[PDB]
Amino acid sequence: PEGPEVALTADILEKYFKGKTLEYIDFISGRYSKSEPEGYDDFIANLPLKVSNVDTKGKFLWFELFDPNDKSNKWYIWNTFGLTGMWSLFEAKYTRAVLSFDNELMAYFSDMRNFGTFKFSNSEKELKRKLNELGPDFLKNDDIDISKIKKYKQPIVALLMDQKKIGSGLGNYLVAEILYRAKIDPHKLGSNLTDQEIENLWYWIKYETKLAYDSNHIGYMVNLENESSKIGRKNYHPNIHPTEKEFDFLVYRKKKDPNGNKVIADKIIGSGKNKRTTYWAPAIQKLE
DNA sequence: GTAGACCTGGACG
DNA sequence: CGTCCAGTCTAC
CATH class of the missing domain: 3.20.190.10 (MutM-like, N-terminal)
Structure with missing residues (x-):
């Protein structure tokens, strides 16, 4: 969910x-x-x-x-x-x-x-x-000001997992996939992101949320998969067109990305008993 | 920043 | 058996 x-x-x-x-x-x-x-x-x-x-x-x-x-x-x-x-x-x-x-x-x-x-x-x-x-709402709102990312001296993955600071809707699997696509290191602080990276990230947030929304069986609403394929989809982020017909995990819970690059299961967010696993590929995602 | 809890498995050795 | 892994709130 x-x-x-x-x-x-x-x-x-x-x-x-x-x-x-x-x-x-x-x-x-x-x-x-x-x-x-x-x-x-x-x-x-x-x-x-x-x-x-x-x-x-x-x-x-x-x-x-x-x-x-x-x-x-x-x-x-x-x-x-x-x-x-x-x-x-x-x-x-x-x-x-x-x-x-x-x-x-x-x-x-x-x-x-x-x-x-x-x-x-x-x-x-x-x-x-x-x-x-x-x-x-990252999926339903097409005009979010993500430039606000720069105001936070925190790991980009944390800012995106937050449901209030920048936008709502992104969870553990979506953020991992979005940062890999945007080629951004999860540890990178929002305050260190370039305007070029910002507009790039925004692009991928829209691409990934829309692809996920259009999917019929990502796996977290199995009780309605039959219904999923019998209903259409609202045209959110109208100008964005994902090539794939079904959402696929490029890094989340993977040993390596589609090209054989090692995928790290990092513990960046949370503490105590609320620590989340962030999957990313160091060969692709960098601090630039 | 750090720790725990809510509650119920699935996958793996 | 046992050991990890799998949205959000509370407290020192």
Whole structure:
């Protein structure tokens, strides 16, 4: 669940559930079966509700609902995928939440590690502040000012993994692939990047996110792979055209890049128990 | 900057 | 068996 997976998932959810009426939501296992989500009791007390939209910003997804007869009464379902969260049209393994729509329609959210989150709110004010905590969506926003990179004396890989400083949506596999394509050493500080490197990086961020979004089976939303190939793709970053028809890992979790160059599995980011692995090829990515 | 935790495996020896 | 590896928040 990196930006592209969450965006595609929302598009599929919109295809199958926009305009549908939600009658009930149940947490059959995981964290929310042990302790209910924030705002759950009030939400259930207000069902049924019609789904007006399903949107995303970076890795954050949310459902917007309302009472047909009371268009003022607007509710939101906040959802975070974590590391293994997945939505599906069938009750897959690790199903945690079951959404019951009218006419027997069903939607399921499964999450093996249970790192995903759910929150219910009928406050648009709160949702807005939540969205403001996230930087511009790297996939959906075509006019981001990444030149802001230069203001940070931090490793470029850290700045890109951050969901607020420059933009939102990039995760561990996307950043590794983007820096390799841009030929930039992960350790390189944003403050040391040239304007030439900046515009180059921006190019690849768009290329990689769009390629990922257009893919049908990268592997992090397997429960909807059949649906992925039965729905189109919004034309984000209209001017960018990836040559490959399916996203492929050039360095992430690889022993060597496509040309035999050694791939290092570096521990640049995090500390203690939150250390992430950054894959890069020293022969290709340099500090220039 | 450094450490841990949330929670459940898969892959490997 | 055991040992790594696999988004985000909290605390000294």
